[PDB]
Write a protein that binds this ligand. Structure first.
Ligand SMILES: *[C@@H]1O[C@H](CO)[C@@H](O)[C@H](O)[C@H]1NC(C)=O
Ligand SMILES: *[C@@H]1O[C@H](CO)[C@@H](O)[C@H](O)[C@H]1NC(C)=O
Ligand SMILES: *[C@@H]1O[C@H](CO)[C@@H](O)[C@H](O)[C@H]1NC(C)=O
Lengths: 186, 188, 181, 188
């Protein structure tokens, strides 16, 4: 048996709290969440465990210190996060970008390119393709590495013609200028 | 002015660890709590400074004690009346940087659908044990589930095959994930 | 004929080993499953662990309710025991097998009845337990059961694999062979 | 070996979304379906000698009838609506590969496989083409095969002799795809 009490604060870049929720779970079942409009715990579960969800709400509702805590909860978030929240919203790591061929898939094309993109944060990134400097349509969300960096890739299937130059165009805030990687058959 | 999520998740369970606390900014983990030492442990060195902050010492204690209460008093009652929710964990292994032979790299073992949060992770090279660099970082996610990350430093070579072996410590269920060189990049 | 068929509570209890099960299925595929004596509820895929949407916990009670009814049907039928049907075993890889490219072997067992069975992976005659995954009993319209076992591996031309199943419907343990070319 | 098995199935059949819905509870002793409740009939009905007592008795219980008469709405429609996004709305791409058996030699008969794996739902259309003309003849399917993990797999084999100047294309169309997938074969 596993139980949770999940406090979750939602704040913008500025540090101004926009939402706050406090929820209680048992056996991966969300039982009751704080209801500010009601200034008390209210069961979110109306099923097999509903009975319990009520019970837990009351045991918590007769608690007094908790009630003030949660009524001022939205503040706690801003107060608790204050020191680092600016550093996190300012945190960005530059993406590395490497382009090479890869085994094709779901295509009649003989060649498949891969644009690799790693070591970047935050995860918001954009990848497009150029063929001799002109947009083309590619053949996803970044994979977190657990260490506050992300990786992703884009693909492009094609037929080689010696002269043609294919380009991967990455854009990411953790980098100052757009990153371009080229590739030619030859 | 986009929004960001700060997640404060206290969880406790039958067996070890009997309790745990995970904070996270967006998806990624900032701190996990060491209760025997009674303090926040930073995921990365750069978070060290704010691990000391003790504004909420009481709030945390309250939750811990309550969460624990739920497990101890409720649960022996539901024991057998209600089925203990569990998932079978999923492991996948990938390189941190693009594969280039003879160039140092790092295998990441990403465990997902982990529930309950009770595991150990072990690496193997051609089916031979190998000491993994660093600890194993468990972390709660949205949905009341968990995930974990473990890393291994290595220098990839053509013939290599690696495996990551996860042991879900309730009933010691094993879940594996193989890795091999696939579409390596030329060096330039 | 129908566009889709959901089945919410294909469940069973059997006297032998006092085992039982409660599941939800959609289009012959399983969402979650409750096992009686394990007292566990397991969702086949992560997305089915929502609990809003896909709440188990009704299981056990479902198993309880259906078990209640057994003893009487047993005597009402003049103790008509269950017959032992032979299961048919199949083995094949999940995706295309390329030498050295990691993959998963799948043992598939149909027409299992009664639902009391042993299934085991063998590598070169050696039994394999580390990293194997298996389903609970899936359901068949004819009211037999299916079962899936999974074994991740790295294809090499140096070893073979057998999926050996043991059932009362068999004269002796049969094993289904697989090896790459 | 003496064993007894009882089963129950609460089947729901949907067409045109939720428009038409038939709820069918089935009670099984071993393999004998001894009684069932069909929504379209409104009553329990004994199917075999074994079910006569229960059939008559349960029909006498009005609380039960009404309860299981709303099951259409309260069970089938209820769950359908809940699962839709992850069941009916589930769509997963196939992985298409084309390869020959017995390494291809000119003028000698061979089979080339179009392996299509990891896709869902199982309903799929797979065709062979030789120099743009849909080659139907010498074609062998396995039909959709369940992997037991919400994915199907199929292989469609075409009989042919590799003569030069022939290019073979397997053309796969599927709900998950916004445009059919084509894979080609060479030969030499
Ligand atoms: C941020 O969150 C608040 C509260 O959830 C919401 O009203 C607001 O629209 C959100 N802003 C953005 C940019 O998502
Ligand atoms: C399964 O294997 C175990 C150990 O060999 C044995 O006790 C049992 O009889 C087997 N079950 C069947 C159905 O053969
Ligand atoms: C299908 O459902 C839609 C919307 O409920 C309705 O327009 C139509 O009558 C139905 N069609 C059939 C063939 O039942």
């Amino acid at each position: 048996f596993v139980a949770h009490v999940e406090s979750t604060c939602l704040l913008d870049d500025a540090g101004t709290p926009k939402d706050f929720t406090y929820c209680i779970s048992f056996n991966k079942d969300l039982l009751t969440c704080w209801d500010p409009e009601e200034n008390k715990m209210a069961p979110c579960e109306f099923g097999v465990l509903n009975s319990l969800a009520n019970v837990l709400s009351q045991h918590l509702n007769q608690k007094d210190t908790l009630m003030q805590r949660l009524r001022n909860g939205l503040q706690n978030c801003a107060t608790h996060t204050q020191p680092f929240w600016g550093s996190l919203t300012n945190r960005t790591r530059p993406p590395s970008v490497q382009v090479a061929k890869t085994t094709p898939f779901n295509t009649r094309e003989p060649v498949m390119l891969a644009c690799y993109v790693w070591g970047f944060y935050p995860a918001e990134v954009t990848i497009t393709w150029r063929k001799n400097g002109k947009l083309v349509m590619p053949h996803k969300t970044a994979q977190p590495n657990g260490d506050w960096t992300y990786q992703t890739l884009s693909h492009l299937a094609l037929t080689p013609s010696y002269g043609d130059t294919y380009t991967c165009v990455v854009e990411h805030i953790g980098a100052p200028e757009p990153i371009l990687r080229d590739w030619t058959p030859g | 002015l986009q929004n960001h999520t700060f997640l404060h998740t206290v969880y406790c369970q039958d067996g070890s660890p009997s309790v745990g606390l995970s904070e996270a900014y967006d998806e990624d983990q900032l701190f996990f709590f060491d209760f025997s030492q009674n303090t926040r442990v930073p995921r990365l060195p750069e978070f060290a400074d704010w691990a000391q902050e003790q504004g909420d010492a009481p709030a945390i204690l309250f939750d811990k004690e309550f969460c624990e209460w739920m497990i101890q008093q409720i649960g022996p009652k539901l024991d057998g009346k209600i089925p203990v929710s569990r998932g079978f964990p999923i492991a996948e292994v990938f390189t941190l940087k693009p594969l280039e032979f003879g160039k140092p790299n790092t295998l990441v073992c990403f465990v997902s659908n982990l529930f309950p949060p009770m595991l150990t992770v072990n690496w193997q090279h051609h089916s031979v044990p190998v000491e993994g660099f660093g600890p194993t970082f468990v972390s709660a996610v949205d949905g009341l589930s968990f995930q974990a990350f473990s890393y291994l430093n290595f220098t990839p070579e053509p013939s290599d095959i690696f495996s990551c072996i996860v042991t879900h410590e309730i009933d010691r269920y094993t879940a594996i994930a193989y890795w091999v060189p696939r579409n390596a990049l030329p060096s330039d | 004929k129908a566009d889709h068929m959901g089945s919410y509570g294909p469940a069973f209890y059997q006297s032998y080993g006092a085992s039982g099960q409660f599941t939800h299925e959609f289009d012959e595929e399983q969402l979650f499953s409750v096992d009686l004596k394990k007292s566990e509820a397991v969702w086949r895929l992560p997305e089915f662990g929502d609990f809003a949407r896909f709440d188990p916990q009704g299981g056990l009670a479902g198993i309880a309710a259906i078990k209640a009814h057994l003893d009487i049907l047993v005597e009402r039928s003049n103790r008509s025991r269950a017959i032992n049907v032979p299961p048919r075993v199949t083995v094949l890889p999940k995706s295309r097998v390329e030498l050295g490219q990691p993959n998963i072997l799948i043992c598939i067992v149909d027409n299992i009845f009664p639902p009391v069975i042993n299934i085991t992976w063998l590598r070169n005659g050696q039994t394999v337990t580390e990293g194997v995954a298996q389903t609970s009993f899936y359901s068949q319209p004819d009211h037999l059961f299916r079962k899936f076992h999974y074994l991740p591996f790295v294809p090499s031309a140096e070893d073979v694999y057998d999926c050996q199943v043991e059932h009362w419907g068999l004269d002796a343990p049969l094993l289904r062979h697989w090896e790459l070319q | 070996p003496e064993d007894f098995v009882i089963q129950a199935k609460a089947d729901c059949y949907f067409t045109n979304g939720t428009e038409k819905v038939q709820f069918v509870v089935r009670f099984i002793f071993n393999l004998e379906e001894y009684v069932r409740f069909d929504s379209d009939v409104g009553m329990f009905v004994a199917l075999t000698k074994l079910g006569q007592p229960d059939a008559e008795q349960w029909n006498s219980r009005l609380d039960l009838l009404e309860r299981s008469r709303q099951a259409v709405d309260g069970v089938c429609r209820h769950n359908y609506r809940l699962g839709a996004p992850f069941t009916v709305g589930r769509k997963v791409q196939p992985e298409v590969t084309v390869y020959p058996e017995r390494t291809p030699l000119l003028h000698q008969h061979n089979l080339l496989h179009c392996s299509v794996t990891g896709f869902y739902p199982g309903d799929i259309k797979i065709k062979w083409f030789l120099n743009g003309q849909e080659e139907r003849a010498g074609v062998m399917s396995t039909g959709p095969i369940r992997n037991g993990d919400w994915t199907f797999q199929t292989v469609v084999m075409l009989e042919m002799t590799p003569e030069l100047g022939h290019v073979y294309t397997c053309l796969v169309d599927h709900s998950s795809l916004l445009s059919p997938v084509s894979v080609e074969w060479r030969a030499q």
